[PDB]
Design a protein around this nucleic acid. Structure first.
Length: 59
DNA sequence: GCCCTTAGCCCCTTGACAGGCGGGAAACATCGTGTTAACCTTCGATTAAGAGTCGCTGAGTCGCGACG
């Protein structure tokens, strides 16, 4: 009943939902890469990577 | 008849295995993940041919009175 009387089958809106998810990921990445501990933690963690730490598949 | 001498049994010391639970080291069969992108975006049973009663709900009928 919830699926039918409430939810409506998204016809040709799958690509729109995918683009919305991509936009949300872009917003999250833009908010992450800013002046805060996230940029310092990602930069400090990446400093050890590349030579003696995980350079690929983890960053 | 008693004491001395010697034999047999019991006990102690060493030991050359034998293999035997068991962790380690290794070779090999599990167990939880992923990942792929060419087409359908409501599936389905199951009482319901006897019988005594518990727990709740919602319709049609009346009183009490006020305003003309």
């Amino acid at each position: 009943r919830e699926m039918g009387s409430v939810e409506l089958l998204s016809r040709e809106g799958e690509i729109a939902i995918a683009k919305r998810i991509e936009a949300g990921r872009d917003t999250m990445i833009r908010g992450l890469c800013e002046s805060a501990l996230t940029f310092e933690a990602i930069m400090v963690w990446r400093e050890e990577l590349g030579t003696g730490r995980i350079l690929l598949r983890e960053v």
